[PDB]
Amino acid sequence: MRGSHHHHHHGSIEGRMICYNQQSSQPPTTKTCSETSCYKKTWRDHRGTIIERGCGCPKVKPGIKLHCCRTDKCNN
Numbered sequence: 001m002r003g004s005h006h007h008h009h010h011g012s013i014e015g016r017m018i019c020y021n022q023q024s025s026q027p028p029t030t031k032t033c034s035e036t037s038c039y040k041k042t043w044r045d046h047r048g049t050i051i052e053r054g055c056g057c058p059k060v061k062p063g064i065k066l067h068c069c070r071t072d073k074c075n076n
Helices: none
Strands: 018-020 030-032 038-045 048-052 067-069
Touching: none
Parallel strands: none
Antiparallel strands: 018 030, 038 048, 038 067
């Protein structure tokens, strides 16, 4: 229940979708992207357990927990 996002009526120019890229030291931070997906992933590294997201979904190193949705905040 309430799993779907909020969306509204439209009539302005088709500008790029705003993804975001927030990180375990950096605020909820936005940008325009048109990669094949926007994503979420997490692993253990020199800094400890670090938290990651950005635009794009290339192959990763083993033990990283990758997930990647098509547009904007749709991964979150």
